[PDB]
Structure 1
Amino acid sequence: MFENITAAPADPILGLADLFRADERPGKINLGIGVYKDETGKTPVLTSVKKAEQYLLENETTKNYLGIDGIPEFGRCTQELLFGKGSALINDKRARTAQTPGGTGALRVAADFLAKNTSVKRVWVSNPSWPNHKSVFNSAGLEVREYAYYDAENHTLDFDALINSLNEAQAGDVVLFHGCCHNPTGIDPTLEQWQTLAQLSVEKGWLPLFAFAYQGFARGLEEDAEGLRAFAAMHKELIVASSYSKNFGLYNERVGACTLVAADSETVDRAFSQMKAAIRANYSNPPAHGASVVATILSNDALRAIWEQELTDMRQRIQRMRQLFVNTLQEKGANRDFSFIIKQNGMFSFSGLTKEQVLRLREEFGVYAVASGRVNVAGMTPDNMAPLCEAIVAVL
């Protein structure tokens, strides 16, 4: 049956980790990881999630199935965080949230909900996009198209090329937005361009589907959500896919949310029950632990206080590593302005290096970067900066 000729192929960002843990070479550096690392090169458990898991250890009395949409508190915290406490959507009950196995679990659920309950045939993902959005959408049977996004020769957002490539999208087409700055690019848009894109989806009939995996890593938790909140300010309907893997350090617990907005409460509840039947046929009901830890921290000032400082330290670290990188590049002699790496947000940026320049990095210097030129700033530490920069300088 699988009796031969069952095919094979590898994940573009993950497969690199294998010939990372494979090298003897001392200075060896893994960039193009997905996760945050501290100054030690460890991805530590947050103190707040350790405190939260101790609470949970003493207080859980059962391990009985969660509802198909998960933990109630979690969903409300997820909407408080994505849309605000003073918020029409939460208020008017036009948003329903399903806790999901990670932000990627939420996109498959958006995708399957969409494929069988609507007329949506295409979904539009930026070029470039996180590689896996495409597979999520194709596995639901939706076909995936690509709108322009990244400049390249200016290292910015090509706003004109974005708009002018998206016009080709017809009305019931889904367009995927990166709310909290973009993987792999690090680029935004500005609030004005978010407003401009929110406008041009209202009059042109597109359905927004936000992917929101790095809330609290660009400017700040709430500042990051202006984009989503510009679109929700004027969309009758939208889907958000959020993850708590990054900002809570809760990666292997698979914590995420799939929020649906639908015009009014009644509609959102009829649509969200088909969202719940898509989940039920998939993984049945979500994993309690990580989400139980998220609902406890956020629903406790003591613990949310420490978490936010923990998030402010993660974010602060990456910002001085984006600054120490551009700077040790200047310092070890670079022939190019890498200062675009500043106002580029989050862990990732395309460094402008070519396929050739990347392979040359891994082979010659032990600096593993995702084959596209994307590097993870959080995998950089103040003791890394000089081996790192030296290598890049050698190559250009």
Structure 2
Amino acid sequence: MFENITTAPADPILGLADLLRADERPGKIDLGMGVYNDETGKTPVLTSVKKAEQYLLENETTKNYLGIDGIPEFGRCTQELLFGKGSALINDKRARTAQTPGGTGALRVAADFLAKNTSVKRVWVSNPSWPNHKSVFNSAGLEVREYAYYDAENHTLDFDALINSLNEAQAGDVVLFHGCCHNPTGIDPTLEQWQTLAQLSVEKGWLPLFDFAYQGFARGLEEDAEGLRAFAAMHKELIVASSYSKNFGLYNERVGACTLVAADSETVDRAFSQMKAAIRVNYSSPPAHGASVVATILSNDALRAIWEQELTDMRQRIQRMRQLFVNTLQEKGANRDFSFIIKQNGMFSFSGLTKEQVLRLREEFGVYAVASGRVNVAGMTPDNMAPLCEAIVAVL
């Protein structure tokens, strides 16, 4: 029965891991997958996380199944982080949160939920966008359409093109927005633009779906969520797929959440019952460890203070590398101006390098980046900066 199965195509991002594995060369530079690296080029476990894991080791008395929607505390802490401690959405009980295996897991649950329980047929994603977005929604039988977003020539957000692109979006359509730190551009809408988009969305009858995987990496926890909050203030219904993989450094523990918002508690509870049905037939219930670590940290003043500082330290080291990257490129004799990357938020730099240049960097210099020209700044260190830039300058 498996005789004629075809070899699956490699994933443009996750597949870089395999190539890096095979590459036997010494000083390879991994600037692919978006994982944080410290000055040493290692991806350490946060101290706040180790302390939480210590706590769980001493106090956990059972591994009995969690409910289908996960740890209740995790859900509450997640909603406060997203909407604000005294949000009306929380007080009016208009939101329900399911703990999921990572933000990717949240996206799949949302997709299965939409495909089977609503009239939704199309999902609009930005151009360019995170490649797995199309893949996930397509697997659920939903078609994906793109809306203009990045201006490759001016390295900025083409708001006019965005609006015009979306005018082709019909009521009942889902429009996907990145909460902050747009992946891969790093360009986010200003608050004014978020507000304008919120109003337009309501009038056009779109169902907003936020992919929020980098809260805290743009400006701060609360600041990075003002766009989503602007939307939540005007919409009756919303869906948020969030992830703690990056802001907690819990990548492999698969910690995320899918939050559903409706007009009232009666409606959201009803809809949420179908989201739980979608989860039941997938993985049944979520993994406890990762989410337990997050809930423990967020609900403890001491641990929370330490975690917030570590998040601040991560954000600041990336910003340092970002400036050092541009300066070194100029220092090494860069062909063109790369100052526009200082304007991008998050772990990435949408460099503008062509597919061939990326291929050559890998082949001839052992420098690994995503074919789209996306480079992981968080993977840069004072030690690999020099050879990194010499290679780039060499392919311009």
Deviation of 1:383 after TM superposition, in Å, equals: 1.1
The one-character-per-residue Cα deviations of 1:118-164 (angstroms, maximum 9, x if unpaired) are 00000001111111011110111111111111110011111111111
Distance of 2:104 and 2:208 partners within structure 1: 17
Moved more, 159-168 or 332-341: 332-341
- CA distance in structure 1 between the aligned counterparts of 2:302 and 2:16, rounded to whole angstroms: 40
Structure 1 stretch 339-348 or stretch 106-115: which is displaced more? 339-348
Larger mean Cα displacement after TM superposition, 312-321 or 6-15: 6-15
Q: Is the 8 A contact 1:106 1:241 kept in 2?
A: yes
Shift of 1:340: 1.3
Per-residue CA shift, 1:310-346, capped at 9, x if unaligned?
Answer: 1001111111111111111111121212111112111
Aligned length: 396
In structure 2, C-alpha distance between the alignment counterparts of 1:335 and 1:229, rounded to whole Å: 42
Q: What are the superposed Cα offsets for residues 17-64 of structure 1, whole Å, 9 maximum, x if unpaired?
A: 222223343332010122111111111011111000010001000000
Contact 2:34/2:378 (8 A) holds in 1: no
**Is 1:125 paired with 2:138?**
no
CA displacement 1:102-123 (0-9 Å, x = unmatched): 0000000110110010000000
- Larger deviation: 341-350 or 171-180? 341-350
Identity %: 98
Contact 2:218 2:224 in 1 (8 A): yes
- Residue 25 and residue 7 in structure 1: after superposition, are their counterparts in 2 closer, same or farther (change >3 A)? closer
SS at match of 2:63: coil
TM-score, scaled to structure 1? 0.98
CA displacement at 1:7 relative to structure 2: 4.6
Report if aligned partners of 2:244, 2:256 keep a CA contact under 8 Å in 1.
Answer: yes
C-alpha displacement of 1:6: 4.1
CA contact (8 A) 2:125 2:145 kept: yes
Of 25-34 and 273-282, deviating more is 25-34
**Residues in 2 aligned to 1:23 and 1:112: alpha-carbon distance in whole angstroms:** 38
* Structure 2: distance between partners of 1:337 and 1:178: 27
Q: Per-residue displacement from partner, 1:225-251 (whole Å, max 9, x unpaired)?
A: 011111101111000000000000001
Q: Distance in 2 between matches of 1:30 and 1:350?
A: 16
Q: Verify: 1:195 aligned to 2:216, yes or no.
A: no
- Counterparts of 1:7 and 1:40, CA distance in 2: 37
Residue 242 of structure 1: SS of its match in structure 2? strand
Q: 1:223-238 maps to which residues of 2 (within 5 A)?
A: 223-238=223-238
Contact 2:94 2:265 in 1 (8 A): yes
Q: How many Å separate the matches in 2 of 1:387 and 1:33?
A: 20
Q: Is the 8 A contact 1:171 1:205 kept in 2?
A: yes
Q: Give per-residue Cα distances to partners, 1:191-242, cap 9 Å, x unaligned.
A: 1111111111010110000000001111111110011111101111000000
- Checking the alignment, whether the CA contact within 8 Å between 1:245 and 1:255 is kept in structure 2 is yes
RMSD of equivalent CA atoms: 1.0
1:27–1:387 contact (8 Å) kept in structure 2: no
Between the aligned partners of 1:287 and 1:24, the Cα distance in structure 2 is: 35
User: Aligned partners of 1:80, 1:150: CA distance in 2, in Å?
Assistant: 31
- Listed one character per residue, the Cα deviations across residues 333-376 of structure 1 (whole Å, up to 9, x for unaligned) are 21212111112111112101011111111112111111110000
Structure 2 distance, partners of 1:181, 1:316, is 14
Whether the 8 Å CA contact 1:33–1:379 is kept in 2: the answer is no
**2:131 aligns to what SS in structure 1?**
coil
* Cα distance in 2, alignment partners of residues 249 and 7 from structure 1: 32
| SS of equivalent to 2:316 | helix
SS in 2 for 1:303: helix
**Aligned equivalents of 2:339, 2:304: Cα separation in 1:** 34
Identify which range, 24-33 or 256-265, moves more after superposition.
24-33
How far apart, CA to CA, are the structure 1 residues paired with 2:71 and 2:177?
26
Contact 1:239/1:258 (CA < 8 Å) preserved in 2?
yes
- Distance (Å, rounded) in 1 between the aligned partners of 2:329 and 2:377: 13
Match of 1:329 in 2: 329
Name the residue aligned to 1:383.
383
What TM-score does the superposition give when structure 2 sets the normalisation length? Answer: 0.98
- 2:222 is matched with 222
Specify every segment of 5 or more residues in structure 2 that has no aligned partner in the other structure, as ranges: none
Q: Distance in 2 between matches of 1:365 and 1:85?
A: 49
Correspondence for 1:153: 153
Determine if contact 1:176/1:210 at 8 Å carries over to the other structure. Answer: yes
Deviation at 1:5, TM superposition (A): 3.5
- Partner SS state of residue 23, structure 2: coil
- 1:9 offset after TM fit, Å? 1.4
Shifted more, 23-32 versus 195-204: the winner is 23-32
Deviations 1:278-323 (A, max 9, x none): 1111111111000000000000011001000110011111111111
1:257-288 per-residue CA deviation (whole Å, 9 max, x = no partner) reads 00001011111111111111111111111110
Q: Is the 8 A contact 1:238 1:260 kept in 2?
A: yes
In the alignment, the residues of structure 2 paired with residue 349 and residue 264 of structure 1 have an alpha-carbon distance, to the nearest angstrom, of 41
